[PDB]
Structure 1
Amino acid sequence: GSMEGILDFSNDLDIALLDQVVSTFYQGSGVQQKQAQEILTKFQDNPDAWQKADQILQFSTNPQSKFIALSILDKLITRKWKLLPNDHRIGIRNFVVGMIISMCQDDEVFKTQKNLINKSDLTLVQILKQEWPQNWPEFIPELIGSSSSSVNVCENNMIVLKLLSEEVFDFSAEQMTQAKALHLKNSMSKEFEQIFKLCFQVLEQGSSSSLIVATLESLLRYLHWIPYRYIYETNILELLSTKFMTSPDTRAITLKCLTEVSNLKIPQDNDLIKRQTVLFFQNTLQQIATSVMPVTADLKATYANANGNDQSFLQDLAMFLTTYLARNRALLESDESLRELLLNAHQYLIQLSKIEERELFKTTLDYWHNLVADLFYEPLKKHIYEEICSQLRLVIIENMVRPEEVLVVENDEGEIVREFVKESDTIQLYKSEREVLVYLTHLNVIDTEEIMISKLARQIDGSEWSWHNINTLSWAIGSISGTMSEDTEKRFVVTVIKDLLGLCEQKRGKDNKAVVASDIMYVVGQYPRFLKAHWNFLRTVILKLFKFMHETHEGVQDMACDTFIKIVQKCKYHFVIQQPRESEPFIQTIIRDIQKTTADLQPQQVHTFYKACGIIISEERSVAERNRLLSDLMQLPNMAWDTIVEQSTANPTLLLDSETVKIIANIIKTNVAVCTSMGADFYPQLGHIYYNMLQLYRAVSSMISAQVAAEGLIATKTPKVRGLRTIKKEILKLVETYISKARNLDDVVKVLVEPLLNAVLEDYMNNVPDARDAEVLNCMTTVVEKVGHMIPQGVILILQSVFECTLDMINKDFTEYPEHRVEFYKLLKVINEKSFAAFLELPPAAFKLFVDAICWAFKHNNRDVEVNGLQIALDLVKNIERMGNVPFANEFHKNYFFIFVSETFFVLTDSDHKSGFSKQALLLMKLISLVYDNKISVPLYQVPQGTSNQVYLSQYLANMLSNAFPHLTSEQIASFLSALTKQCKDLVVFKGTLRDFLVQIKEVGGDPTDYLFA
């Protein structure tokens, strides 16, 4: 249509047409709403739109239009106020104040246009932040004086004061300079004595609700910062804890105020203040017990019904009780007349802890952690909470959530399946529950065991049989592992495991047998100390795990393999020795039947089994016996490896068979799995396959390039090429795994390195970009990390083969080849760290690209790239400084010092790299400190001769910042650089000066004296 006419500012603004575009946006839909959206944004973004705000506030009949007008003024006041002449600033102030008073005195507008008035109050506060009090010292006296003329004006004055307190004390850290925030903080602190009078009077005498609620809402903000005497040396605590708790329309905001009072670290030596802190808590709990609910109420059912504000009130009550008791409960623990209050409050928390609400449970659980940890150490306190803790044991045992190890879960259709995603929130909640229950067990082991032994009895006889009930109980049993002593724990677990061994072979069903299998496996995996001292049990356990590896359910199979590793990581000594009443070490029995045991396991679970055997075999430290145990274990993969190597030296096509690719990759995956658990002990097995594996790597590499030439780049997506590249990735992963754990570095350099680089480097360099495996870069990083100091020519070769070609892949955008970006800068980091000489061997053009690569990593929003890039620049500067006064170091500063200084200033100030501010500040401070410590023994310019680098640096940065931020006065830039220079050894203050600069570049007229804050 013709809605764009309002964007023409030559003619008068059609107020009516504006009101239609606004109504089309908010109330419309589809294209006309999107059309009106782009028009309203353009109208709002016009630098002259604020001059039309006067007539929009007068002649418009649409509240949303007046809202947008205020947003246009808000941008003016926040960013360009100090550029207007003195008459415009007074003019805008007057008609904002005039409109506010106008809307308050009209009683009907005061009720119907709450949004427009709130937007006006916030806008007025933006003027206060610019003008008050140095140009409006009578604001608070006038505001207090106008409060008595009208009750609407008074209620709105509480909103203005609330907003002002928020902007000065709660949201000023990142929006004002340090000097400005300190200025407005002192200004409000000076005038608060007269603000509390108005607040207390309105609270003492009180009209009806609305004005009280707005007053209490403003008080909640004052409690963040005002002195304690305003709270304890007046009657306001008696008003909050009694009067404003009775009426439900002020109960919520009063409860939030009392929570804020409860959070203060009161003078712990004043018997009077302790008396008032006990008093308002006693009054609050009495008001709840008589006006809201008694201590015996089913808050779980109250919260589930969700009537009115019940859920928010119970949330705020939980927050009030935990905040107060975590800080002041000692005030109640000694006096015997305060005991019932102390226990009724905790009984409310017990009832609150039965609500089905994850986040609310975490809140009350956080306090229970605070309590039981104190009862664990503080003498003579446990007995006070004996009945509270006993109830708490029931609650936590019945609300245990599923730990990591349990891979079986009930599905949305009621079937017990295997979990596909890991629930990080559930895992953390289980650990928090375990931490509390472990403390609760220490506080009374007898009570804990009886609850668990009684619940298990009613699980065994079907009286309370339930998937939920057998799971929570079993997870609670495993979580308290380590709290009982041996013999005491011996008694306990033999009992538990037996009934679980029973229940397992009593309940028939695909689902039931899988629920008990996971509970058995979790409990048993949590008690290795018991399994160590009972080989007969451990062997029975291990054989049940093998029996679970033959079940149909993949989750039971997976957990059996994970439980096997978990047990073996702690009990591996009992597998290598000849146990009494045994024919051989149990590892020898496992290795022999390894084909039968793993007959039904999928490949990635067979590999986990082999990794578990590798943990056992590494316990044996007899070199001959272990290397033989290693050979016995790898028989099947080596036998299959010899076959696909005997018939592969001839007939190269065998590798191309899809089934053979899957077999080859699983063989290498088994070698990776074992090498992970054995580390440096894997060397005998690695050498048995190493030279053949690298030829296989060459054979696979040629086939890959042949496919891409025959089929195109699309070949890299096919299952065939994807399968071949897996062999390359698994080969690199195996070599990287070993070298990362190798102890015999001489063997690595003399035997492993030279065939590795020959097989991977030119293959990576001469493949097309889409065929390059980022795992090559990852492998070279481990080489340079572990033996980089022993192969200075290998590091040079690594650079030449990957540096330029990988940099070209990742320097056109920020998202193509994401795994290459991460591994690329990880490699450049370790080379620049442990083998910096390789960069000295780069041609000056290739060193220019190196600096370009570092700064390119600055501008990444990817934290994996951004962090490494700032670390490389920091280490490069240190590497250059350690060289001293040589041509390369002097050439470096001449060519690159100001490139690093300016590229660091760019990402500091572009508002798009806030996540790396700390490391950016650290880099800029190191660069500035170089000049002001005379560590650069050459001139940085090509300015009259004899001038210092200190002087040129200041002239350079002042000129740089002047052109980049032209709206800054010369003295703003001068004072900022002066402070930034004096502070280049004090990172905290240096970062404070930078943050003050980032505030000032967002507005006009920043005070240059702000940089003298320190």
Structure 2
Amino acid sequence: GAMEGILDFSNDLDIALLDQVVSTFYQGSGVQQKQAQEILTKFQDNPDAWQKADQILQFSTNPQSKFIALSILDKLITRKWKLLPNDHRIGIRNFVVGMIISMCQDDEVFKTQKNLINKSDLTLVQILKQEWPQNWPEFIPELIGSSSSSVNVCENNMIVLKLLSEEVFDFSAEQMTQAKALHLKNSMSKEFEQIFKLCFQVLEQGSSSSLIVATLESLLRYLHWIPYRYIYETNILELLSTKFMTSPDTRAITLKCLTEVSNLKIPQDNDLIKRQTVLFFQNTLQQIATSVMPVTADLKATYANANGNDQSFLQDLAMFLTTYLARNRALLESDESLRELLLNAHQYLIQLSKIEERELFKTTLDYWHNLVADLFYEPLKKHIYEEICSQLRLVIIENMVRPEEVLVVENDEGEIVREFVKESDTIQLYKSEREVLVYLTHLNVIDTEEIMISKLARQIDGSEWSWHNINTLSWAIGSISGTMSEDTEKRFVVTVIKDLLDLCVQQSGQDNQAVVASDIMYVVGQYPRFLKAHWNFLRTVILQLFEFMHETHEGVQDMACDTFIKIVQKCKYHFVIQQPRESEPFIQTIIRDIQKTTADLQPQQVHTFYKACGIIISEERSVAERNRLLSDLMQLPNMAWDTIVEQSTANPTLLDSETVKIIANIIKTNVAVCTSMGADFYPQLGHIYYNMLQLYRAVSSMISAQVAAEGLIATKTPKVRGLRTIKKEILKLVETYISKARNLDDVVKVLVEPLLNAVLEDYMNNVPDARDAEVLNCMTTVVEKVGHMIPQGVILILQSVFECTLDMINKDFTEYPEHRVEFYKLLKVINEKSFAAFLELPPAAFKLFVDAICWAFKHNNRDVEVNGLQIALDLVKNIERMGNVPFANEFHKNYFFIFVSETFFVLTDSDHKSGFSKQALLLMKLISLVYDNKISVPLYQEAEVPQGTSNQVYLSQYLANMLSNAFPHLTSEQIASFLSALTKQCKDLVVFKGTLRDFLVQIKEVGGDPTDYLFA
């Protein structure tokens, strides 16, 4: 198109045309905009593009054009500056400076072209980073001088300095070498005296200017690093905390500066400084009260209204108060004359803590946590804050977020329904609230009780009744469990329950009932200690829960299940024993009636139920009695099972979806019970084990048959998915059991051979899409637990899954994601526990193993990458451990350099940044192996190098060459310097890593200083 003209550099740049392209991109739309965008990117990325910058700046009438011009320069300056002839550097400096001056002197431009001026300033700052002060020593004194000549220039200088400080102190770590960083910090520091003087003057001879704001913006940055004397030994605190608080255009920035001040590095034994720290706070609070809002002000209301910058201001105030107090409140606590101030500050916080804004609430809550945690320990402090804490109890009790256990929620139509999904983002909020409230309760249990007991009584008499109110209250009451003495707790809980049951009676209809049920269940679940001392009560609670298991209300029903197991998890012993005035242990009662109780439950709920019963059964330590209970519990699934095993062994025609589901649910139930019973599950496992493995085979045959007859698409079908669920659940059951098994001999002698026989060949001999990753997962646990006892087995596992799995996952990084992850976990544990298995591999297979490892490195998926790196490290150790033997020798000869280069590659490609640490570790280990002469054979082949040549010398040479070719823009000395530093530092990871990081900086530019690698 017409627009592509600008891409043809063999002809002059048509600026007018450029401007059109740019306008089209920014102001245009659809296809046109899109084309223009691509055109512009191409232009920008053109390595000569920069040469046009001056022409653009001069002749363009579009600020975006110039901005782009500046991005081009910025790229050139940051990446290639020292590649440029000297003349070109000067020229660039001059026209960047000139432009800035010129834009500052024209008021209209200065007022209306801020974006472009800001960009220009940053561009300049990039030049400074390269050139200053070594090749620009006068920059600052002249900047300083220039500032008096013009208000615009002066203001603009402030922007420049703010950017410089940012680039030097705040954002340098990732972007500069250690040496260069230091150099520029040092340089800034050596001249800050003068910088500050200007800053102070401007601040003195002004009130509410854009110049004042700019100055204050720069101060915010300086505060990150300047020595404290500049803050404390000048009049600056007075200015900030009085003058600059009074006008709103300066207020926001001032407050942020004062916040940073409240974190300055500051001596602790200096009374006068303490006084100053007190004074600025006192001033600041005085300004708020008189210029903004009194302490009584309704901050919730104000925030909710969202005028102007109110939300921001309130946020910054919270940040200011919390930061200051957290650090300094002790300064205010002893001196009676400071009491009012301390309390008023807190009262502001209390008011802010009523605001409806989750994130802001969390900020304040974190402060409260800090405070109460301190009051809980520190002698004679709590009484100061008694009234503050009392108001806090209210705020928290009334803003309790829904606990994760409370599964009912109000929909948009005012109906109490089951939640669609977990409220995942309120989990931490609840913990934080509970923590603070727990502390608050400990601080004054009488207050807390009185508050709760009377709020509650106001629900009963109806005066204050509402869903929100009973809820927040109930949740609060549940959340403080543990804070009272058993005895105190006892009466409290009695009163609460009585009242909730009262509400249960008075408040009817399904929605009301759902709410009250949820609340009671939450409360009861939260007080196991109580339950344990009140058997009758406990028993009645459980029975009531069972009733709920027949609720048509799904939310309540589901909650009953979770509450049941929640209670059982803590109280199980009381179900296992025979209670006074009971005819049988309660578990017996539960089991006898399990069909009735669980009839209306969803399958997974039924499994949860069975799981709970398992917890109870495992309390029984007498083996005969326990096994008997297990037997009884499993009676229904075992009978279903026994009849299924009949029908299928007569004829492999299971083809029934109903049957498939039944089987799946049988296994799932076994899994559920195994999960809670662990090692104790063994007898039940044995009842089904052999038939279960046969069934696994039968089902495997069906899946294959189905794929053959219908195609791969078969695997999507409900039928096939169902058959696989059987296989997966089988695998899960065995995995679960083996992970918890206590008798490893039976695992090996009884479980392992048939398992392997049943699953391995099937996995190996299925088409890729039919292979269950769960097999891999199972095998990991097997190797983990008994790998040391089954060398031949481990070999078998590898033979059957290694190559076929590798071939699934080695075409790209994305296909078969579960296989991929499980695959490397398996290799990991094999490499750890059964290294011998890899020693037995044929050389070809071992090479693929090495490949497999490196491939893992190159993943961005962290699950894979991390394991890759670990396996590599373990492998190196495994090899080292073997000593000077042929296998070790061969390994190094074939693979040492493969690992070194692969590790380097991922370190340096900018795409594996998450792995930096472990990469570094691995690299350091590899280098240390040579540096320590732990490699007994020459790593080179003969005639390649003189015969005597040490592995150290060779390693250097290899590396220099690899780097020279890989990064040809680096100088030899840069490479040599880097390698010397790095090899010397192969015993000190933190230093070694810094050297790596410096290198990653230098490879992104040209002309990096080789001496940088001497940093120490």
The alpha-carbon distance between structure 1 residues 505 and 695, as it changes in their structure 2 partners (threshold 3 A), is farther
SS in structure 2 at match of 1:581:
coil
Residue 208 of structure 2 contacts residue 249 of structure 2 at CA under 8 Å; is this kept in 1?
Answer: no
Q: Note the C-alpha offset of 1:423.
A: 2.4
Q: Offset at 1:92? A: 0.5
**Is the 8 Å Cα contact of residues 208 and 250 (structure 2) preserved in structure 1?**
no
CA offset digits 1:176-213 (Å, max 9, x no partner): 00000000000000000000010000001126510000
The 1-side partners of 2:219 and 2:423 are apart by 40
Shift of 1:417: 2.0
Identify the range of structure 1 (87-96 vs 261-270) with the bigger mean alpha-carbon deviation. 261-270
Residues 245-276 of structure 1 show CA distances to partners (whole Å, capped at 9, x for unaligned) of 00001000000000000012421100010000
Match for residue 976 of structure 1? 978
CA deviation map 1:142-190 (0-9, x unaligned): 0000001100000000000000000000000000000000000000000
Secondary structure of the residue that 2:841 maps to in structure 1?
Answer: coil
Q: For the residues of structure 1 that align with 2:878 and 2:500, how far apart are their CA atoms?
A: 63
CA distance in 2, matches of 1:864, 1:509: 50
CA contact (8 A) 2:738 2:781 kept: yes
Aligned-pair distance for 1:877? 0.3
1:569 equivalent in structure 2? 569
Alignment of 1:900-911 (within 5 A): 900-911=899-910
Distance 1:422 1:995, change over 3 A: same
Structure 2 distance, partners of 1:498, 1:818, is 54
Q: How does 1:255-266 map to 2 (within 5 A)?
A: 255-266=255-266
- Paired residues for 1:369-518 under 5 Å: 369-518=369-518
Q: Secondary structure at the match of 2:191?
A: helix
Please tell me whether residue 367 in structure 1 is matched to residue 367 in structure 2: yes
What are the residue-to-residue correspondences of 1:763-802 with 2, within 5 Å? Answer: 763-802=762-801
1:954-981 deviation line (CA, Å, top 9, x unaligned): 0000000010000000000101000001
Q: Which secondary structure state, in structure 2, belongs to the residue aligned with residue 169 of structure 1?
A: helix
Task: Evaluate the alpha carbon distance shift between residue 208 and residue 432 of structure 1 in structure 2; reply closer, same or farther with a 3 A threshold.
Answer: closer
Among all aligned residue pairs of Structure 1 and Structure 2, give the percentage whose two residues are the same amino acid. 99
Distance 2:974 2:179 in 1: 14
Q: Which residue of 2 aligns with 1:667?
A: 666
Aligned partners of 2:664 and 2:656: how far apart in 1?
A: 12
The Cα of 1:424 is off from its aligned counterpart by: 2.6
Q: 2:408·2:417 contact (CA, 8 Å) conserved in 1? A: yes
Bigger shift: 532-541 or 630-639?
532-541
Cα distance between partner residues in 1 of 2:414 and 2:1009: 66
Does structure 1 conserve the Cα–Cα contact (< 8 Å) formed by 2:393 and 2:448? Answer: yes
Deviations 1:58-81 (Å, cap 9, x if unpaired)?
Answer: 000000000000000000000000
Q: What SS does structure 2 have at the residue aligned with 1:487? A: helix
Q: In 2, distance between residues paired with 1:258 and 1:891?
A: 65
Instruction: Tell me the alpha carbon deviations over residues 800-828 of structure 1, each in whole angstroms, 9 at most, x when there is no partner.
Output: 00000000000001000000000000000
1:634-661 deviation per Cα after TM superposition (whole angstroms, max 9, x unaligned):
00000100111122221221x1101000
Between 799-808 and 200-209, the greater mean CA deviation after superposition: 200-209
TM-score by structure 1 length? 0.99
How far residue 510 of structure 1 moved from its aligned partner, in angstroms, is: 2.3
State how far apart, in whole Å, the 2-side matches of 1:150 and 1:35 are. Answer: 43
1:831-886, Cα deviation, whole Å (9 max, x unpaired): 00000000001000000000000000000000000000000000000000000000
Q: Please give the secondary structure, in 2, of the residue aligned with 1:135.
A: coil
Deviations 1:366-404 (A, max 9, x none): 000000000000000000000000000000000000112
Is the contact made by 2:207 and 2:244 (CA closer than 8 Å) also made in structure 1? no
| 8 A Cα contact 2:407 2:559, kept in partner | yes
For 1:366 and 1:345, the matched residues in 2 are separated by 16
C-alpha contact 2:228 2:265 (8 A) present in aligned 1: no
After TM superposition, the structure 1 stretch with the greater mean CA deviation from structure 2, 539-548 or 482-491, is 539-548
Task: Render the CA deviation track for 1:688-722: whole Å, top value 9, x for unaligned.
Answer: 00000000000000000000000000000000000
SS in 1 for 2:506: coil
* Matched residue SS, 1:147: helix
The 2-side partners of 1:1006 and 1:652 are apart by 73
1:550 is paired with a residue of what secondary structure? coil
Please point out which of 962, 966, 986 is paired with 2:964.
962
Shift, 1:466, TM fit: 1.2
- Give the superposition deviation at 1:502: 2.8
Residue by residue over 1:893-927, the C-alpha shift from the partner in whole angstroms, topping out at 9 and shown as x without a partner, is 00000000000000000000000100000000000
Q: 3-state DSSP class of the match of 2:242?
A: helix
Cα distance per residue 1:521-556 (max 9 Å; x no partner): 111111111111111111111111111111112221
Q: What are the superposed Cα offsets for residues 205-233 of structure 1, whole Å, 9 maximum, x if unpaired?
A: 12651000000000000000000000000
**Greater mean deviation of Cα atoms: 561-570 or 288-297:** 561-570
For 1:505, what is the secondary structure of its paired residue?
helix
Q: Quote the Cα distance in structure 1 between the aligned partners of 2:176 and 2:609.
A: 60
Structure 1 residue 467: deviation in Å? Answer: 1.2
CA contact (8 A) 2:376 2:439 kept: yes
Cα deviations by residue, 1:721-744 (Å, 9 ceiling, x for unpaired):
000000000000000000000000
Long gaps (5+) in structure 1: none
Instruction: Evaluate the alpha carbon distance shift between residue 737 and residue 505 of structure 1 in structure 2; reply closer, same or farther with a 3 A threshold.
Output: farther
Secondary structure, in 3 states, of the residue corresponding to 1:409? strand
Q: Distance in 2 between matches of 1:890 and 1:419?
A: 62
Q: Deviations over 1:416-465 (max 9, x none)?
A: 22223222320100000000000000000000001111111111222111
Separation in 2, partners of 1:922, 1:461 = 68
> What CA deviation, in whole Å up to 9, does each residue of 1:325-352 have, x standing for no partner?
0000000000000000000000000000
CA deviation after TM superposition for structure 1 residue 504, in Å: 2.4
CA contact 2:347–2:388 (8 Å) conserved in 1? yes
- Aligned-residue CA RMSD in angstroms? 0.7
Moved more, 409-418 or 236-245: 409-418
What is the CA distance between 1:414 and its match in structure 2? 2.7
Q: Which whole-Å CA distance do the structure 2 matches of 1:410 and 1:122 have between them?
A: 52
In the TM superposition, residue 500 of structure 1 has moved relative to its aligned partner by 1.6
CA shift for structure 1 position 38: 0.2
Residue aligning to 1:832: 831
CA deviation string 1:544-574 (max 9, x = no partner) = 1111111112221111111111111111111
CA distance in 2, matches of 1:384, 1:549: 50
What SS class does the counterpart of residue 329 from structure 1 fall into? helix
CA distance in 2, matches of 1:484, 1:18: 75
Partner Cα distance (1:278, 1:518) in 2 = 49
Q: Distance in 2 between matches of 1:842 and 1:511?
A: 66
Cα distance in 2 for residues equivalent to 1:912 and 1:413: 49
Number of the residue aligned with 1:6: 6
> How far did 1:487 drift?
1.3
Separation (CA, whole Å) in 2 of partners of 1:463 and 1:696: 63
Mapped to 1, the partners of 2:691 and 2:465 lie a distance apart of: 58
> How far 1:517 sits from its partner (Å)?
1.2
Deviation readout 1:664-692 (Å, 9 max, x if unpaired):
10000000000000000000000000000
Residue of structure 2 in register with 1:220 after alignment: 220
Contact 2:208/2:247, CA 8 A, preserved across alignment: no
- 1:755-805 CA-to-partner distances (Å, cap 9, x unmatched) read 000000000000000000000000000000000000000000000000000
The C-alpha deviation readout for 1:276-323, integer Å capped at 9, x for no partner, is: 000000000000000000000000000000000000000000000000
Q: State how 1:282-297 maps to structure 2 within 5 Å.
A: 282-297=282-297
- Contact 2:199–2:215, Cα closer than 8 Å, also in 1: yes
C-alpha distance in 2 between matches for 1:950 and 1:965: 22
Contact 2:478 / 2:522 at 8 angstroms: preserved in 1?
Answer: yes
8 Å contact from structure 2 (residues 6, 18) kept in 1 = yes
Separation of aligned partners in 2, 1:83 and 1:414: 70
Q: Which runs of 5+ in 2 are unaligned?
A: none
Whether the 8 Å contact between 2:452 and 2:477 is mirrored in structure 1 is: yes
Q: Secondary structure at the match of 1:80?
A: helix
Alignment-derived partner of residue 162 in structure 2? 162
